[PDB]
Design a protein around this ligand. Structure first.
Ligand code: HEM
Ligand SMILES: CC(C)CCC[C@@H](C)[C@H]1CC[C@H]2[C@@H]3C(=O)C=C4C[C@@H](O)CC[C@]4(C)[C@H]3CC[C@]12C
Length: 423
């Protein structure tokens, strides 16, 4: 049931008049239409203004300027003195009731951002990730083995059985979340980054119920670790002193929520889109499987470029900015479309070819660099690598058998369900 594709094919041309970045219906279209829309913007309207989507649109606040060029997204990322992460990194205004749960370091500027990031950043270094490499592989090995055992007919949903669980288990392990609570945590983060998709929720009170629930989970776990320290990130949070003063319970909960949402709702889509690409372009599977360790570094970078799991991130101007002939005003919202930068014809020879040997590969799936560069980048790369190594070893012919069920989202390039089959 997988539709045939030809590597290197550009999307059909999308007329400039047909693009509505502010409509839910646009984000419901398939990737060819979306990719073609962003190609048209790069060529004919590389900076342009759009209204918020209608999803909770009455409280969204103002519209935004869309940056579609790799170099413009780079400039914005590298100059937070102009393009601020405060007050929010999605288009929607962060209302007071949302700020209760989501006013974390990701919506702060330096120096407070850096002081918060430094509490945990040593647990995400390459050498620390190398320590828990063996744990990461054991968890991936066991999940892939369970897929074979749980599905003797050789068919299953890659997302529920592997792509979701592996990153979930790792970040829960690093936070010190008990094994019995994994499913509950994943349900909550699925809803928090699925608002607007009816398979997740379209009811904002249910969203607020979930946010309440994970916030209360976080504070209860932090309260236990304050009494009895463990060697986990939650204990690092309760123990930290920023200029002699400890974090508030509110600050601890927001930080906890940031880490588990980010760890649960990103890598899984790199894996699902990676499987889809290897299914559509079998020469690339054949190349990688023939020399997994020789090709893994370039293959992992190309999977992130192809998937762009985070579609965009917002910034806010503190001064007037005249960029590429477009005059934007102090206080305007500006959006950084990584999904577009990662197809930029000025930065990639042959952007429409999925090439697991690609080098160089200046992909900005982890953002354009700078102060908020993805804290989990090293971890995510290892998570992707070990999952595909275990699929290669245990079920080398695993392939998608249907087009995926796509998450309805402007922010997250989500695959909800991906049927696969193996011999
Ligand atoms: C392939 C997987 C992932 C992708 C594509 C991705 C993408 C991103 C992007 C685009 C940003 C914003 C960068 C910027 O503003 O310049 C970000 C920030 C962040 N990510 Fe990742 N992410 C991934 C996996 C993870 C994982 C597994 C974690 C584990 C906890 C994580 C934790 C974070 C955190 C904490 C931040 C905020 C950093 C800060 O504000 O200083 N991410 N991520
Ligand atoms: C992908 C990761 C790297 C980052 C995750 C960030 C998470 C923890 C946080 C940071 C800011 C939060 C959003 C917000 O402030 C406003 C709204 C509007 C509301 O109508 C629906 C929910 C939404 C999109 C929030 C969803 C959760 C977000 C993205």
């Amino acid at each position: 049931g997988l539709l045939p594709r030809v590597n290197g094919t550009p999307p059909p041309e999308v007329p400039l008049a047909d693009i509505e970045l502010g409509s839910l219906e646009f984000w419901g279209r398939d990737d060819d239409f979306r990719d073609g829309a962003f190609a048209t913007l790069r060529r004919e309207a590389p900076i342009s203004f759009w209204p918020p989507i209608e999803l909770a649109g009455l409280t969204a606040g103002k519209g935004h300027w869309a940056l579609t060029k790799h170099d413009d997204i780079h400039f914005a990322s590298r100059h937070p003195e102009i393009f601020h992460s405060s007050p929010n990194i999605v288009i929607h205004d962060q209302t007071p009731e949302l700020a209760e749960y989501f006013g974390s370091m990701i919506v702060l500027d330096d120096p407070r951002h850096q002081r918060l990031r430094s509490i945990v950043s040593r647990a995400f270094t390459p050498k620390v990730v190398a320590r828990i490499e063996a744990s990461v592989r054991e968890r991936a090995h066991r999940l892939v083995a369970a897929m074979i055992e749980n599905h003797p007919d050789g068919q299953a949903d890659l997302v529920s059985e592997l792509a979701g669980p592996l990153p979930l288990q790792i970040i829960c392990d690093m936070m010190g979340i008990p094994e019995e609570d994994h499913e509950q945590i994943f349900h909550w983060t699925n809803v928090i980054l699925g608002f607007g998709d009816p398979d997740l929720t379209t009811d904002f009170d249910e969203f607020l119920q979930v946010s309440m629930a994970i916030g209360g989970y976080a504070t209860a776990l932090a309260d236990d670790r304050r009494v009895n320290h463990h060697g986990d990130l939650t204990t690092s949070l309760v123990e930290a002193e920023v200029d002699g003063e400890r974090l508030s319970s509110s600050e601890i909960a927001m930080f906890f929520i940031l880490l588990v949402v980010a760890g649960n709702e990103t890598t899984r889509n790199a894996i699902s889109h990676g499987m889809l690409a290897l299914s559509r372009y079998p020469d690339e599977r054949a190349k990688w499987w023939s020399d997994f360790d020789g090709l893994a570094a370039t293959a992992v970078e190309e999977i992130v470029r192809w998937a762009s799991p985070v579609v965009y991130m917002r910034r806010t101007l503190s001064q007037d900015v005249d960029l590429r002939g477009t005059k934007m005003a102090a206080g305007d919202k500006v959006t950084l479309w990584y999904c577009s930068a990662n197809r930029d014809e000025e930065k990639f020879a042959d952007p429409w070819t999925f090439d697991v040997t690609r080098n160089p590969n200046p992909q900005v799936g982890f953002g354009g660099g700078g102060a908020h560069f993805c804290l989990g980048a090293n971890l995510a790369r290892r998570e992707i690598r070990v999952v595909f190594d275990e699929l290669r070893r245990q079920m080398p012919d695993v392939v998608a058998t249907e087009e995926p069920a796509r998450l309805l989202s402007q922010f997250i390039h989500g695959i909800k369900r991906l049927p696969v089959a193996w011999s």
